[PDB]
Amino acid sequence: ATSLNTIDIQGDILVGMHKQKQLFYFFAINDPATFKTHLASDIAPVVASVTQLSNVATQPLVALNIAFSNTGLLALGVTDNLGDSLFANGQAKDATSFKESTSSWVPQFAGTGIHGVIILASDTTDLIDQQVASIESTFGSSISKLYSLSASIRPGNEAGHEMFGFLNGIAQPAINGFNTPLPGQNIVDAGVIITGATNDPITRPSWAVGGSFLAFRQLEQLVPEFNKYLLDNAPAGSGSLQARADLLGARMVGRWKSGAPIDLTPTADDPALGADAQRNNNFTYSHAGFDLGSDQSHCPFSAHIRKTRPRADLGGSLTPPNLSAGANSIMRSGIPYGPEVTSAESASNTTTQERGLAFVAYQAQLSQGFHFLQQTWADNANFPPGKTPATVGLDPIIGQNNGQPRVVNGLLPSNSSASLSIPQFVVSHGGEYFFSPPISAIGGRLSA
Ligand code: HEM
C-alpha cells in the first residue's frame, strides 16, 4: 500500500467538477514542442486537483482537467506501455465488443485523430469560452479543436437528473482511506480507480502513478420515445396511467426518478428516501424469506443498476454493505447534453434534436470497468448468473444487440417470466478512451 496523494490526482476523477456547465474540448496536437511548452506553462498550473475540489472554499471559477488518448501520448513522444490494451487500441476498435458499429459514431470519434480532451467546467458558458479563448491564444496553432460537446446540469427540479428524469450520480464506489463510506456503498482499494495506487495489480510507468483511464461516451437519449413506451406498456393497477408508467420506468432503472431504490420501496416512490444519501444506497438485493435466484418482486434482475453493480447477485454479504465485485467499480462523472425536450417533440412522441448523456467513467483497468459492465453484464442476456428464468435479458437502459430490439425479462411485477422487446432508448454516437495523468506528469513527463 502507498499513500493516496490527492494533491496530484485530477479532480474530476474522484470528486467531479460539480459545475452547472461543462465543455468537452477534443483536440489534436500540432507542433508538439510548442504544445509541450504551453502544456507546462498554461495548463498544468490550472488543472484542478482532488484536494482542491474536495474543499467547498476552493472550487475554482473554471475547473479544468485534461486527458490524452493513446495517439495523443504518441504525439507527445510518450511511447511507454501504460498497461491497458483497450486504451492503447482506442475505443473505435472496441466498438464491436458492445454490439454497436462505428458507422453510427460522430466521425471524429471513428478513428484515432483525437489526441486528448480538455474538460472545462464553470457555472457559466461565458467563463468556459474565455478559458478556451485563452488556451487557443497561448497555444496558438499547436492545439486544434477537432470536436466539442457542451453539457449542462438540467434546470429546476431536474437538477442532477439525467435526460430521462432520474436522479443520477447517487452511487459511486468509496475509496478506502479517502472516502467515508455511506450505508450500502461499496468500498474499494484506490487502485481500482487510480493507476498505481493501492492494490492496482498492473505495473505502470512511474510518471503515470496517480492517473486514471477516462471512458467517454456520447450517449443520445430518445426521451419522448421512452416516455411513450412507458405509458404504452404501463402495468395494470390502481394509480393514474402515469403513475403506472412511472413504476415501469423505475423497474427498468432500479430507482424511482427521485433516487429512491426500488429494492427498498418496490411499489411506490419515496421521495424522502431518494434524497437521503444515508439511506438511498443501503441495500444488497437480498431479502430474507425470498430466493435471490428467482425473486424479482423487489427489483428485476435486468434493472440497470442491478446489471452494473450486481451486489449480492455476485455473492458477499446479504446485509449491507455488500462488497462484491469491487474490482468492477467505476467512478462516474457524466453530465447531460443537448436541449431540453421541446413542446413539439413531446407532443409527437418523437425526437428531433439530439440530447443525452455525456458519459464519463474512470477506472484503472478499462477491461474491468466500463468495458466489462457494458459487454459482460449489460449486454449479456444470461447475467446475472444463477437466476430462474436463467435468461435475464438485456439492460433496458444501455443493453445493446446490434441495433435490434432488446429482450428484457422480469420487468413486470405481476409475472417475472413476462418478456418485453424494447427498442433502444439510448443510442451510442461513440467516444474515446483517454488517460487522465497525475498533475505532476502534465508539466513533467508529458511536457518533456
Ligand atoms: C444514457 C445512458 C445512461 C443513463 C440514462 C444512465 C442512468 C443511470 C441512473 C439513473 C442511475 C441510478 C442513479 C445513480 O446511482 O447514479 C445509474 C447508475 C449507474 N450507472 Fe448508468 N446510465 C447510463 C449509462 C451507463 C453506462 C454506459 C454504464 C456503464 C457501462 C453505467 C453504469 C452505471 C453504474 C455503475 C451505476 C451505479 C450502480 C450502483 O452502484 O448501484 N451507466 N445510471
Author numbering: 1 to 448
How does the study describe this entry?
DyPs (dye-decolorizing peroxidases) (EC 1.11.1.19) represent a new family of haem peroxidases widespread in bacteria, archaea, fungi and other micro-organisms. In the present study, we expressed A. auricula-judae DyP in E. coli, solved the crystal structure of the recombinant enzyme and several site-directed variants, and used PELE (Protein Energy Landscape Exploration) to describe the binding of its typical substrate RB19. The DyP structure is formed by two domains, each of them including an antiparallel four-stranded large β-sheet and two or three helices resulting in a ferredoxin-like fold (plus two additional β-strands). In spite of the obvious similarity between the two domains, only the C-terminal domain harbours a haem cofactor.
At the opposite side of the haem, Asp-168 and Arg-332 occupy neighbouring positions, suggesting a contribution to the haem reaction with H2O2. Then, the exposed aromatic residues identified in PELE and QM/MM simulations were substituted to verify their eventual involvement in catalysis (information on the effect of mutating haem pocket residues is provided in the Supplementary Results). Moreover, most of the variants show crystal structures largely superimposable with that of WT DyP, except for the mutated residues. The EPR spectrum of the WT DyP resting state (top) shows a ferric species prevalently in its axial high spin state (g⊥≈ 6 and g∥=2.0). After adding 10 eq. of H2O2, a strong decrease in the ferric signal, and appearance of an intense protein radical signal are evident (bottom) (the electronic absorption spectra of WT DyP, and the EPR and electronic absorption spectra of the D168N and R332L variants are described in the Supplementary Results and Supplementary Figures S4 and S5 respectively).
